[PDB]
Amino acid sequence: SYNYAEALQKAIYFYECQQAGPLPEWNRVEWRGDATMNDEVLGGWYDAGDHVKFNLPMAYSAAMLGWALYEYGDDIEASGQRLHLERNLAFALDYLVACDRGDSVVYQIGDGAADHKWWGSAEVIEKEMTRPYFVGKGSAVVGQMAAALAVGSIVLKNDTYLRYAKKYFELADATRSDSTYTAANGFYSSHSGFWDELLWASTWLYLATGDRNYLDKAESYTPKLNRQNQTTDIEYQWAHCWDDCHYGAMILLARATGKEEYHKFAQMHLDWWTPQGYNGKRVAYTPGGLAHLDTWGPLRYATTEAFLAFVYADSINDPALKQKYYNFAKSQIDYALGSNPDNRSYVVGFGNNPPQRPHHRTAHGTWLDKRDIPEKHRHVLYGALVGGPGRDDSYEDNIEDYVKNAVACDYNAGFVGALCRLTAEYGGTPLANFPPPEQRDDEFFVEAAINQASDHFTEIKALLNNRSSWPARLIKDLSYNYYMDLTEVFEAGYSVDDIKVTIGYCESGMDVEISPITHLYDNIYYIKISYIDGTNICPIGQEQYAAELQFRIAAPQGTKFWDPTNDFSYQGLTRELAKTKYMPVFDGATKIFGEVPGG
Amino acid sequence: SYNYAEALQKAIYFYECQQAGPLPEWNRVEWRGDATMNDEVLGGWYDAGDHVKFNLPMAYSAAMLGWALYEYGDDIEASGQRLHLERNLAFALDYLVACDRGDSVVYQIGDGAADHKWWGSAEVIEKEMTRPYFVGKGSAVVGQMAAALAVGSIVLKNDTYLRYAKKYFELADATRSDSTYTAANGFYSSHSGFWDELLWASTWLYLATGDRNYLDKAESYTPKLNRQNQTTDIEYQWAHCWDDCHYGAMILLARATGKEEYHKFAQMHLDWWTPQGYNGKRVAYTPGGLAHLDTWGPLRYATTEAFLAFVYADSINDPALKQKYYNFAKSQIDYALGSNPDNRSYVVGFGNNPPQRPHHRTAHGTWLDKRDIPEKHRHVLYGALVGGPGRDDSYEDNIEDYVKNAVACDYNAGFVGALCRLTAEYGGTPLANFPPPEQRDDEFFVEAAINQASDHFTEIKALLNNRSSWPARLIKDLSYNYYMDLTEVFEAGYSVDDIKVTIGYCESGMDVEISPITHLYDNIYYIKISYIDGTNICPIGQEQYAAELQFRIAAPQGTKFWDPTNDFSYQGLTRELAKTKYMPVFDGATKIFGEVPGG
Ligand SMILES: OC[C@H]1O[C@@H](O[C@H]2[C@H](O)[C@@H](O)[C@H](O[C@H]3[C@H](O)[C@@H](O)[C@H](O[C@H]4[C@H](O)[C@@H](O)[C@H](O)O[C@@H]4CO)O[C@@H]3CO)O[C@@H]2CO)[C@H](O)[C@@H](O)[C@@H]1O
Ligand SMILES: OC[C@H]1O[C@@H](O[C@H]2[C@H](O)[C@@H](O)[C@H](O[C@H]3[C@H](O)[C@@H](O)[C@H](O[C@H]4[C@H](O)[C@@H](O)[C@H](O)O[C@@H]4CO)O[C@@H]3CO)O[C@@H]2CO)[C@H](O)[C@@H](O)[C@@H]1O
Numbered sequence A, B: 001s002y003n004y005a006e007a008l009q010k011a012i013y014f015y016e017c018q019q020a021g022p023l024p025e026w027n028r029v030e031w032r033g034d035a036t037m038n039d040e041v042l043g044g045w046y047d048a049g050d051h052v053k054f055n056l057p058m059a060y061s062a063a064m065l066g067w068a069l070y071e072y073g074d075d076i077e078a079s080g081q082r083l084h085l086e087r088n089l090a091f092a093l094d095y096l097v098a099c100d101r102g103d104s105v106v107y108q109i110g111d112g113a114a115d116h117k118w119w120g121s122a123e124v125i126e127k128e129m130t131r132p133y134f135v136g137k138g139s140a141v142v143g144q145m146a147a148a149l150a151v152g153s154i155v156l157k158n159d160t161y162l163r164y165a166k167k168y169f170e171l172a173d174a175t176r177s178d179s180t181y182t183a184a185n186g187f188y189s190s191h192s193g194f195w196d197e198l199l200w201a202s203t204w205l206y207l208a209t210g211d212r213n214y215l216d217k218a219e220s221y222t223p224k225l226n227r228q229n230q231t232t233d234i235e236y237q238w239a240h241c242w243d244d245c246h247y248g249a250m251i252l253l254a255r256a257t258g259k260e261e262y263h264k265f266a267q268m269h270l271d272w273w274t275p276q277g278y279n280g281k282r283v284a285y286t287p288g289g290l291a292h293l294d295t296w297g298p299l300r301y302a303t304t305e306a307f308l309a310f311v312y313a314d315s316i317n318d319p320a321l322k323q324k325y326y327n328f329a330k331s332q333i334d335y336a337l338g339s340n341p342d343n344r345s346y347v348v349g350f351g352n353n354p355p356q357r358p359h360h361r362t363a364h365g366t367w368l369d370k371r372d373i374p375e376k377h378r379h380v381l382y383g384a385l386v387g388g389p390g391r392d393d394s395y396e397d398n399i400e401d402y403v404k405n406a407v408a409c410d411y412n413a414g415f416v417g418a419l420c421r422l423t424a425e426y427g428g429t430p431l432a433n434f435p436p437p438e439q440r441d442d443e444f445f446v447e448a449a450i451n452q453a454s455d456h457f458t459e460i461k462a463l464l465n466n467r468s469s470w471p472a473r474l475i476k477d478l479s480y481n482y483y484m485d486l487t488e489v490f491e492a493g494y495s496v497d498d499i500k501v502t503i504g505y506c507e508s509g510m511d512v513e514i515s516p517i518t519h520l521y522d523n524i525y526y527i528k529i530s531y532i533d534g535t536n537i538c539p540i541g542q543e544q545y546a547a548e549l550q551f552r553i554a555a556p557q558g559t560k561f562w563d564p565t566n567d568f569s570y571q572g573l574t575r576e577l578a579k580t581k582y583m584p585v586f587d588g589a590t591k592i593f594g595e596v597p598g599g
């Protein structure tokens, strides 16, 4: 129906867009550089369109990429995506290992409230704020970390991952409490409690080790799971998700043990998701055929259930059930890819009419802590599955819509697994030469205006800009030059000594020096304006993205020879600020923008 | 009961405090300089605690000082004040002559609304605003200018004043309209109309010339005067004042003609002012004995009536009437000087517990367009009669009370005449060596703080202040020096050319240069911070009284030798802004504040 191989290729690439510093050598994202290098634990993924590392959804997302490989790794070698998926997973699992603090873990980097108040690119956030870390022993977060490491140890054949999976499971199982999990409250609160994480983790530890003691633990947790409403059934009217993986765990146990209780649960849960429902009860469906669990990330929930449904259908023999679940699964993935009332992809950079304004700071590429400028994203967030449409299939591509245009690690995770299943079956050719290079705009440049002209002086207002985005970055040794032709000065009988440079305004906190008038060649001379710590010119807000200086170059009062019209840097200037290529910008001795007299 | 000679001495000096530029060489006020030198007509008096020249009250005030000399000039020779009164009067009359524009006159300098919106000293107002002038031929204003010059011509024996008096009288009489008198609206509108000015001017012209044609004109105007309420009597229930001088004109005509109608009017009018009243009708009196005509300037009105009552009493023979009017007159002057329920003088700088916060911009001496700072006036407005108490004798000395602490030319004018009569009678010794010198504050100085510091730099925040007040003034070629000892630099094998001067903040609009590091003697060097137009540093507002610069002097980054503690200009600096004597200030090459290494 779609090129599922290309979709898979892009959905994996999304994770490279999310990587915190230091980036691996293989990172393919031209607009990403090392970022948040002062974080207490390095690497891992930024969670969503923000810069917080939230370990619960991060570990969940890793666990799901691990599960994708566990089911379909061999079946996707043809797509060419297996190696990409494996090393992207490893990057996250390495972070989880790096969080170990013995009887506790670092479970969050960054404060949600503080992070979210600011809109700008990852690489420059340390100029805006100082990022905290959080330590604890929450059973849900630690349990999920264990699960991700357990499946990761299988698929990546890695004994360190297994050792840490065991460590974290033991901690979580000994703690049996979410009370020390607080930093993510209101963002990723533990809603279901922790017994489902202990189930998920112990199940994966059993699949990793074959040690029946884990299967014993797993089966011991099921009576502690939340019930459906006031009945005795285990809750089934929700999705497998970052908060609650008992759904997937029961499917794994159905296949691993063959026991009827797990098959019963799997069928009741999946029937509730399908259009036929479960004895008169069913998830809400949009008229366009999307199973729509909640306002937040309906595509995430539906595509995750697609993966579970594929796995369960592949694991049973009953042809009616297999077809019902397979059809459900493929219908949800296909909706996401364009089988909907608008015939449009909800995967950024893929298919017909994809979203172009995902709620994502670093892909947007602002310089002034606004969402509306630039009006178009500077970068392509390939592969990101957006939140998706409302309950009635309605949708508008709007950066302000942090619900419908949300993107996140957990949104892509189950989706990757389902795309693995579909490319396994239908093939498809991934894109060669992916990703293609982006059109860039000017990043470092001066905007200048004639602040005042006089028969004896020129006064310039000059803003040295850092609107960098490929990647956003900091340059310390910034300077620019203003070139003049002094022929008229010498013809009048005057000298360079008779020309005075003064300052009429210099922006607070921008340490600046202006050189003496310096000879270039012939009658061409210049001044250099140097910012000693140019990293303070940075795309983090209205005040910081440019440093303003007003400088005056003056012959003596009363003289009538001054001619700015033959000065190279005056060319094209008006009374309104405008970018000029004739006041070139330098990083140390290297010219990075503009032109010099005589080329 | 008072030293009326000292009161007179000070009440005259008040006018010197009011003089606009260019000041005469004999001006005795150390805190006044040439001010408003760009005015369309130079000289004359600022009206009140403001800087508007309002010709109607100005000319009224001059006419009253003239009348004082006409009646009592010989009689005050012993007080030593005659020559002071004469030259003060001439300064105003010269302005009135200079207002001539042929078919019209300049009748105002300054926009009342813009003038009053700003709180600051006369000598610096042109940095704040441009002052318009206004031209017209309003009969009241021109008529009063005529009257002032007519009496002035007599008492100063001056043919030029008589010539302009006649010309202005003819202009006022030809025009017979206040329609072209607009700029004073709401401040000094013509309330009574212009017939009384024509009466007053023609009466003075008769007294000046002995030409009975002027007497005939004068008498021709009396049927045109306003009536008392609905009656046939000429209005008598008010005071002789800036708006209406018919009261005094009638007294002059009683003496000049002997005619019963004028005596009848004079006695009706003066009886209404006395405690005994006229036919049961009387001006309001306070319980403390002040005749209280209106909320605005009650002392002004009462002391003016005292002068009229003295003049009329001295012109009649009836001992009963003479004592009634003399007692009234003396009671009102004595109230103003301290014979009141609070035993307090209402004349600034005179007597017991005088007002210390008159509503007067220049005497206050602010630098930041505020009334509350400084909390005490920096100058003594000697001789100013304030508005005075309420109808219940209530009063508080508060700069904000522009009613009770109002001061003005017209408040002092009749008052001087009454003081002349009282000094004539009682003698008194004027103050020797008046005025005494004031305690002065520092006027031009740097406030500095260590803004940032490290092992390779010093960063200073420096505010170059102009809080001048003795007098307030402007200095264009302002600079200050920051002195260092570079011993440790050479000691480390580095040169002057290894020390970098940079700027971290330069206040907008303050064109500034910083010299290279310049040698003084030994290892002592300095940078000079020069303001190209230092007149923009001026005591006109919160933002203008000081220019802020943040400068950094830096050894190379990484180095460890930098030693600010042997730097002369570093001495005593803290992290909080404070005046420092070690960053000396210069006007051109002349030090005007502070100290220099080694003297
Ligand atoms: O009670 C029913 C059911 O609840 C399940 O728990 C739910 C919570 O009820 C629900 O509020 C929570 O919703 C999340 C949503 O899943 C996240 O995707 C969204 O994430 C934000 C993030 O918080 C921001 O930091 C970032 O900028 O944007 C992302 C993407 O929008 O956050 C909201 C609020 O936390 O989801 C829970 C899990 O589905 C229980 O699991 C189940 O047992 C209950 O029956
Ligand atoms: O109807 C009765 C009577 O009126 C007389 O005219 C009066 C006006 O009625 C009265 O409003 C006016 O009040 C003046 C007052 O004399 C001034 O001293 C005051 O001056 C201000 C000045 O305007 C400001 O610029 C400055 O900052 O402060 C000073 C405070 O002194 O201004 C008010 C308003 O103009 O006075 C008139 C004359 O007494 C008629 O003369 C009479 O014929 C009527 O019967």
Ligand SMILES: [Br-]
Residues within 6 Å of the ligand: B103, B104, B135, B136, B137, B180
């Ligand atoms: Br006119």
Ligand SMILES: [Ca+2]
Residues within 6 Å of the ligand: A140, A190, A191, A192, A193, A194, A195, A196, A197, A243, A244, A245
């Ligand atoms: Ca849970």
Ligand SMILES: [Ca+2]
Residues within 6 Å of the ligand: A484, A485, A486, A487, A488, A562, A563, A564, A565, A566, A567
């Ligand atoms: Ca030139």
Ligand SMILES: [Ca+2]
Residues within 6 Å of the ligand: B140, B190, B191, B192, B193, B194, B195, B196, B197, B243, B244, B245
């Ligand atoms: Ca009048």
Ligand SMILES: [Ca+2]
Residues within 6 Å of the ligand: B484, B485, B486, B487, B488, B562, B563, B564, B565, B566, B567
């Ligand atoms: Ca030193």
Ligand SMILES: [Cl-]
Residues within 6 Å of the ligand: A274, A275, A276, A277, A324
């Ligand atoms: Cl179905």
Ligand SMILES: [Cl-]
Residues within 6 Å of the ligand: A372, A373, A374, A375, A376
């Ligand atoms: Cl834009």
Ligand SMILES: [Cl-]
Residues within 6 Å of the ligand: A431, A432, A433, A434, A435, A436
């Ligand atoms: Cl491509």
Ligand SMILES: [Cl-]
Residues within 6 Å of the ligand: A594, A595, A596, A599
């Ligand atoms: Cl070039």
Ligand SMILES: [Cl-]
Residues within 6 Å of the ligand: B348, B349, B355, B356, B357, B377, B379, B380, B381
């Ligand atoms: Cl005082």
Ligand SMILES: [Cl-]
Residues within 6 Å of the ligand: B431, B432, B433, B434, B435, B436
């Ligand atoms: Cl004295």
Ligand SMILES: [Cl-]
Residues within 6 Å of the ligand: B594, B595, B596, B599
């Ligand atoms: Cl000295």
